[PDB]
Design a protein around this ligand. Structure first.
Ligand SMILES: CN[C@@H]1[C@@H](O)[C@@H](O[C@@H]2[C@@H](O)[C@H](O[C@H]3O[C@H](CN)CC[C@H]3N)[C@@H](N)C[C@H]2N)OC[C@]1(C)O
Ligand SMILES: [Mg+2]
Ligand SMILES: [Mg+2]
Ligand SMILES: [Mg+2]
Ligand SMILES: [Mg+2]
Ligand SMILES: [Mg+2]
Ligand SMILES: [Mg+2]
Ligand SMILES: [Mg+2]
Ligand SMILES: [Mg+2]
Ligand SMILES: [Mg+2]
Ligand SMILES: [Mg+2]
Ligand SMILES: [Mg+2]
Ligand SMILES: [Mg+2]
Ligand SMILES: [Mg+2]
Ligand SMILES: [Mg+2]
Ligand SMILES: [Mg+2]
Ligand SMILES: [Mg+2]
Ligand SMILES: [Mg+2]
Ligand SMILES: [Mg+2]
Ligand SMILES: [Mg+2]
Ligand SMILES: [Mg+2]
Ligand SMILES: [Mg+2]
Ligand SMILES: [Mg+2]
Ligand SMILES: [Mg+2]
Ligand SMILES: [Mg+2]
Ligand SMILES: [Mg+2]
Ligand SMILES: [Mg+2]
Ligand SMILES: [Mg+2]
Ligand SMILES: [Mg+2]
Ligand SMILES: [Mg+2]
Ligand SMILES: [Mg+2]
Ligand SMILES: [Mg+2]
Ligand SMILES: [Mg+2]
Ligand SMILES: [Mg+2]
Ligand SMILES: [Mg+2]
Ligand SMILES: [Mg+2]
Ligand SMILES: [Mg+2]
Ligand SMILES: [Mg+2]
Ligand SMILES: [Mg+2]
Ligand SMILES: [Mg+2]
Ligand SMILES: [Mg+2]
Ligand SMILES: [Mg+2]
Ligand SMILES: [Mg+2]
Ligand SMILES: [Mg+2]
Ligand SMILES: [Mg+2]
Ligand SMILES: [Mg+2]
Ligand SMILES: [Mg+2]
Ligand SMILES: [Mg+2]
Ligand SMILES: [Mg+2]
Ligand SMILES: [Mg+2]
Ligand SMILES: [Mg+2]
Ligand SMILES: [Mg+2]
Ligand SMILES: [Mg+2]
Ligand SMILES: [Mg+2]
Ligand SMILES: [Mg+2]
Ligand SMILES: [Mg+2]
Ligand SMILES: [Mg+2]
Lengths: 155, 188, 260, 167
RNA sequence: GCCCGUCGCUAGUACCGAUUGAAUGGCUUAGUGAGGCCUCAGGAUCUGCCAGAGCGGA
RNA sequence: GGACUUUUACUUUGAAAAAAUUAGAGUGUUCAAAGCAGGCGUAUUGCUCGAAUAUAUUAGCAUGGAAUAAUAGAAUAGGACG
RNA sequence: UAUCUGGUUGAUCCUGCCAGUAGUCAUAUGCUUGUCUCAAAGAUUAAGCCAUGCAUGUCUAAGUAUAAGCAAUUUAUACAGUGAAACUGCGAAUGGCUCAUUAAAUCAGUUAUCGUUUAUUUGAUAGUUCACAUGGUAUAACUGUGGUAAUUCUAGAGCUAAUACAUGCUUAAAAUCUCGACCCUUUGGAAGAGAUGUAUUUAUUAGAUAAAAAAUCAAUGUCUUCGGACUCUUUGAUGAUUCAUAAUAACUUUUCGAAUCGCAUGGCCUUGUGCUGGCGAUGGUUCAUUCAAAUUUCUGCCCUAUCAACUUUCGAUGGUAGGAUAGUGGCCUACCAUGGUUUCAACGGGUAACGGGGAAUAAGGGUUCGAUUCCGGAGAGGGAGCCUGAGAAACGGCUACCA
RNA sequence: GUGAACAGCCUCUAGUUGAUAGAAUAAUGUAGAUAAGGGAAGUCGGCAAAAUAGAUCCGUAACUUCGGGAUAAGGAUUGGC
């Protein structure tokens, strides 16, 4: 998703209070603000090198990561600039002294810093409410391939 | 009245939620100001915990900053040429945040040709002094320049007039003024 | 629930108050003030249950309305006033001076001081902020806002205070090896010496502690109140000085010396 | 018994919502509005009683009205109010110009009078002088406390430059 | 010896059943829609900056 | 402080944990259910011990463990180190 | 605190139930009832209905007293004692009661506010404003004349107050900015004029630190030991921010910056009722603190498939923008995307379902209950709507409907 | 031209204006209209009559030979610029 047009909305997309003076001629054009989210999390290169905009991007945006931090694997990429992860986990029934498989499906807004794919585990930091569903934000991507290369052409 | 509660609506699963308790005064919402131009008239909502807010409707004047000139002057608002949310706001010339207006340019033209003297478009002792200390910065931009002939400048409302009672904002400049310039005459 | 609650049922009352089940319905509700509801002593629980000077509540007001009581030099005529840690309660009759400080069992103590020691008190800086027009201000667990302080004062430190005016007369840093008071946690009331502090970016710094019997424990950084330098407390400690003998070692102290 | 409330422009009785600061309603709680029954403002045969104020006299005096005369209840209380009842400007010292009322307890006949409010008193200027006093006396003491800092930190920077010598 | 099913007397329970049956409680399309609130107006009379006049306030 | 780190289950320890209830120490309510009192002289001007402790578990946080059980890696090398 | 006994056969050992036995912080009932201490109690049915009474009022030396009130004597020709009424203020959002609703709701433990509001308490914080020996009316109580069968119903007329209503003066030093009459040709310098508290809205600049050095371009700071040269003055917090804080240009039906009250009355002359000054009350903006609030993270419920697909008429999932709110957020609105849940049981149905602390039963494991003394949530016949206020969607507040 | 249309209504080309006539406007008729409130009580019987009506969007039961029932039922909308 994202991945072109930068301007595609009827609204002109820009970072708040980051001003490019027209009279002062710059060869970089855009002056692009960022930070590092903290909590020992790398603000990735593409957040800086990128041309993108989104204000829900915890590195270039106005949302701050605090509270829980969660691991889980991506089951759905179908939404633009957000995704749903399945964090499974086991539940202990005291009577039977056993465990039963459970899961909870967490929608989380993926900044357009990351290329996320289905099957990739992802680390996710908690943030302020973003959409109806999403209280969490993609932070680190733990799987760069997930078998992608082992599928290969004939010879 | 209006309620911003999520107790209405539905589940994320798409389940109907039952009616639980009632509306509370703190889930509350109120009507749109739908602020307009002309004849300044403003009503004041008394909000949660004292905290007056200020309802703009009919404001004909507001303070607009020149982004790259580091100066700000209050002007007239001449209309609305664009708006990203609904086109009906441009037609009705309703004033909202991020609404694209036209302003005056004359308080900006009076000030530029004083601070500089370059007579957009188109003798005192210490005057020629600072006039000469200036320029080199007098180039401005063609796209702000050419506007000045018409006598109306493209501004953008940066405030929330129904909330704050004021209509303020900045002159469209650089990339924005470049972008709206497309949709402006690619719609008109 | 439509407003702030103005009562306290006497069960949900904090138990370090040590109030009997029957004999009433409600606790007194600590007023708003320097100290928090859960952690505080209202003068009524003090002038009545602790010090037994006033039998009624009726007597506690008939006392306080004579100006006799005062806290940190100010008179304090309100019955439910939320007195608490480090506070100095001075009766001008009886010429008694008390500092309100914790036992090892966790309650507040009735602990006298000199006419002198009464005139200063510690507080823990709860944050260091830069106020309006540049003035940095420091603020304390008891709610004192103090401006123009020493730049070497940081959060979690402690401060000596004048109580006549309010100025800072000294500041003790937070460094490994400082005498320390535990306010909060089960270890609340234990005392002294700070062997280590575990970082935990993301909150809740753990602090090891060893008293001098050479016993060791841990609490939250928030529960650590720096009282001074090793072996020297800046204020008068009470009997036992926050050690915690086990229930058997307190059983031998009682089953031997005092009385029979 | 329903009263007339002007402004309705009706011969008829209608019900309305009544608030603070309108007639026929005496609100009994803060913000209490109550629906009452108001009689219209236009006259009709239906009124048991009518209220009339005389704009001009007439060639015949009327027994209990033009013939007789009543005292006002209370005299001026506010200082300048006595001043502008009698027209004294600010010199004439309105104290002895207060109005006094008699009364008699079993031949003990006595006297009483207002307390002139917003009077200029020596006590009242002592406070005014005191207010301009505290405000300036406070003002400078904060400037000196500010200089105590500007000394404390600047002489902390002369400790930080002199420790570079230790390096 | 045990023992089965129809038939038949008595009592109880449930079922199916015309009545386009009935009642209770809860959601709901559509139609109508009190009321307060927001807003556009209005302006009984009453003031603002003794013939009279302008444009703001109640 | 920089630069990175395959991810799990489990088990240790801890911090944070309302009272009342419960288990339970103390105290002779005259016994007792209780209650959290009281107990000592110099009983005409005071002294003084108390109001303990434990339980709290599934989840959350912090920590020692690396067995059992999952999980990922180099094979059309698009491999590892410098 | 790990226990069985009786009942199928002619007898038998089994299966398996019935019955016996035991306790119940479990109700009911019946017989019987002397004493001390302790004390549950119209929850279960019907959150069904209600006659009457009562359950929320409130004043200090200290906001307003001319009661035609009482009372003094005792100093008060302005007032002063005491003080009904009325204005002003605050409270009335606590308490108390009940469990109707409610099954991802509430709740519990655990988080979040870098997502917000907060009277009050506590601690700080105000020289800057254009008659100042202190500026204006407009009113209750009251007085009198009235209407009604009828109520805490009120009308007309005549008074009079304020910490109510509404206005409106004030104060040091210095400094940095802009403009700038003149003379001046030089790197050029200038009297004098305005602006500058705080709050509001906007935009722009600072808010550094990741180890070291160089040419150029425009503007332009501070020193000349006259060619040139040049800072080790700012450096706050957090895991992390556009944070605290600061500065520049303007903006505003300009927020605030005392027109207030109780006690005492003491200095200081150049003797003007001159100029000062004590102990504290009530206030006042901002910040903190506390009392709270509202959302909020992870994980956790009973029966049911004779409920398998659910959600998106008309928000369902997400994006962008605005509106709205105290604030975040499909909270609402425009355009846009086609999404979100489920056999790891969604969705639906039921609950004689408020949830938790806890309760009973005492090998362990379990089973069963919790309306109910504590916490949390809901509601005041049913629904909605709203005024007042810091705080209510209040019901011993109002408005409407249905009953 | 309107319109789904060779419907109806109006028109062009063409073709008629032919059917005893005048004057009145009672009853009773033939043919067409409308009636307050009630709503089949009229009647062998709703006979007659009234109500319905097009399109677009929403919604649709028993039952069934699964093809149907179905325009089921029941709704909302409609001009001009
Ligand atoms: C209908 N006549 C009877 C019928 O009534 C029934 O009777 C028995 C009876 O014979 C048994 O009892 C007999 O045999 C026992 C042998 N130990 C002793 C007691 C004796 N009465 C009972 N225990 C049970 C009844 N249901 O079972 C047997 C039968 C012949 O069918
Ligand atoms: Mg405020
Ligand atoms: Mg921390
Ligand atoms: Mg934190
Ligand atoms: Mg037979
Ligand atoms: Mg049946
Ligand atoms: Mg409807
Ligand atoms: Mg448990
Ligand atoms: Mg029994
Ligand atoms: Mg007997
Ligand atoms: Mg009942
Ligand atoms: Mg009832
Ligand atoms: Mg008095
Ligand atoms: Mg009152
Ligand atoms: Mg309550
Ligand atoms: Mg219920
Ligand atoms: Mg204060
Ligand atoms: Mg006031
Ligand atoms: Mg950094
Ligand atoms: Mg900002
Ligand atoms: Mg800021
Ligand atoms: Mg007064
Ligand atoms: Mg969105
Ligand atoms: Mg919001
Ligand atoms: Mg129920
Ligand atoms: Mg239950
Ligand atoms: Mg349990
Ligand atoms: Mg319960
Ligand atoms: Mg009860
Ligand atoms: Mg309620
Ligand atoms: Mg209903
Ligand atoms: Mg209902
Ligand atoms: Mg209600
Ligand atoms: Mg009631
Ligand atoms: Mg109530
Ligand atoms: Mg009905
Ligand atoms: Mg009913
Ligand atoms: Mg056609
Ligand atoms: Mg045709
Ligand atoms: Mg012919
Ligand atoms: Mg014929
Ligand atoms: Mg004829
Ligand atoms: Mg004739
Ligand atoms: Mg005829
Ligand atoms: Mg007709
Ligand atoms: Mg009809
Ligand atoms: Mg009809
Ligand atoms: Mg009908
Ligand atoms: Mg018929
Ligand atoms: Mg019929
Ligand atoms: Mg018939
Ligand atoms: Mg018949
Ligand atoms: Mg027939
Ligand atoms: Mg027919
Ligand atoms: Mg019809
Ligand atoms: Mg139809
Ligand atoms: Mg038309």
């Amino acid at each position: 998703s994202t991945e072109l047009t930068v301007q595609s909305e009827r609204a002109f997309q820009k970072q708040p209070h980051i001003f490019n003076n027209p009279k002062v001629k710059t060869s970089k054009r855009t002056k692009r603000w960022y930070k590092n989210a903290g909590l020992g999390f790398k603000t990735p290169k593409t957040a800086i090198e990128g041309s993108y905009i989104d204000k829900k991007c915890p590195f270039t945006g106005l949302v701050s990561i605090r509270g829980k931090i969660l691991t889980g694997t991506v089951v759905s990429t179908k939404m633009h600039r957000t995704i749903v992860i399945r964090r499974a986990y086991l539940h202990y029934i005291p009577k039977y002294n056993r465990y039963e498989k459970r899961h909870k499906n967490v929608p989380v807004h993926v900044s357009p810093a990351f290329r996320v794919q289905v099957g990739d585990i992802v680390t996710v930091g908690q943030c302020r409410p973003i959409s109806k569903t999403v209280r969490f934000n993609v932070v680190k991507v733990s799987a760069a391939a997930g078998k992608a290369n082992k599928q290969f052409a004939k010879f | 009245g209006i309620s911003r509660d999520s107790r209405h609506k539905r589940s994320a699963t798409g389940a109907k939620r039952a009616q639980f308790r009632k509306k509370r005064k703190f889930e509350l919402g109120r009507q749109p100001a739908n602020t307009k131009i002309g004849a300044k008239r403003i009503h004041s909502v008394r909000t949660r915990g004292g905290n007056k807010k200020y309802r703009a409707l009919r404001i004909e004047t507001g303070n607009f900053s020149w982004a790259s000139e580091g100066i700000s002057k209050k002007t007239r608002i001449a209309g609305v040429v664009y708006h990203p949310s609904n086109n009906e706001l441009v037609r009705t010339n309703t004033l909202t945040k991020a609404a694209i207006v036209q302003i005056d340019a004359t308080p900006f033209r009076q000030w530029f040709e004083a601070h500089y003297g370059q007579t957009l478009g188109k003798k005192s002792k210490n005057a020629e002094r600072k006039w000469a200390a200036r320029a080199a910065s007098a180039k401005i931009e063609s796209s702000v320049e050419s506007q000045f002939s018409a006598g109306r400048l493209y501004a953008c409302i940066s405030s929330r007039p129904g909330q704050s009672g004021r209509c303020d904002g900045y002159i469209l400049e650089g990339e924005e003024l470049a972008f709206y310039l497309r949709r402006l005459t690619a719609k008109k | 629930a439509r407003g702030p609650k103005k009562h306290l049922k006497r069960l949900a009352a904090p138990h370090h108050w040590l109030l009997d089940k029957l004999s009433g319905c409600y606790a007194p509700r600590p007023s708003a003030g320097p100290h928090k509801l859960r952690e505080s002593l209202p003068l009524i629980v003090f002038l009545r249950n602790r010090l037994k000077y006033a039998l009624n509540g009726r007597e506690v007001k008939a006392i306080l309305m004579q100006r006799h009581v005062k806290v940190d030099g100010k008179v304090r005529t309100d019955t439910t006033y939320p007195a608490g840690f480090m506070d100095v309660i001075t009766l001008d009759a009886t010429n008694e001076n008390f500092r309100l400080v914790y036992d090892v069992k966790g309650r507040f103590a009735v602990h006298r001081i000199t006419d002198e020691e009464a005139s200063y008190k510690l507080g823990k800086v709860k944050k260091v902020q830069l106020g309006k027009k540049g003035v940095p201000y420091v603020v304390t667990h008891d709610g004192r806002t103090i401006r123009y302080p020493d730049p070497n004062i940081k959060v979690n430190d402690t401060v000596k205070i004048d109580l006549a005016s309010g100025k800072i007369t000294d500041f003790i840093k937070f460094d490994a090896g400082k005498l320390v008071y535990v306010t909060g946690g089960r270890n609340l009331g234990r005392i002294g010496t700070i062997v280590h502090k575990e970082r935990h970016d993301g909150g809740f710094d753990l602090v090891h502690i060893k008293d001098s019997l050479d016993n060791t424990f841990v609490t939250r950084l928030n529960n650590v109140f720096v009282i001074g330098e090793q072996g020297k407390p800046y204020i008068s400690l009470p009997k036992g000085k926050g050690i915690k003998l086990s229930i058997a070692e307190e059983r031998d102290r009682r089953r031997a010396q005092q009385g029979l | 018994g329903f009263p007339m409330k002007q402004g309705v422009l009706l011969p008829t009785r209608i019900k309305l919502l009544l608030t603070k600061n309108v007639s026929c309603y005496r609100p009994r709680r803060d913000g209490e509005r109550k629906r009452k029954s108001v009689r219209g403002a236009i006259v009709g045969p239906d009124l048991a009683v009518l209220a009339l104020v005389i704009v001009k006299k007439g060639e015949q005096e009327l027994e209990g009205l033009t013939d007789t005369t009543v005292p006002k209840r209370l005299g001026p209380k506010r200082a300048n109010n006595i001043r502008k009842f009698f027209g004294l400007s600010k010199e004439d010292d309105v104290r002895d110009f207060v109005i006094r009322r008699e009364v008699t307890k079993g031949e003990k006949t006595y006297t009483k009078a207002p307390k002139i409010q917003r009077l200029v008193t020596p006590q009242r200027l002592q406070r005014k002088r005191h207010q301009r006093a505290l405000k300036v006396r406070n003002a400078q003491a904060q400037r000196e406390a500010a200089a105590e800092y500007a000394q404390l930190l600047a002489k902390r920077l002369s400790e930080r430059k002199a420790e570079k010598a230790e390096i």
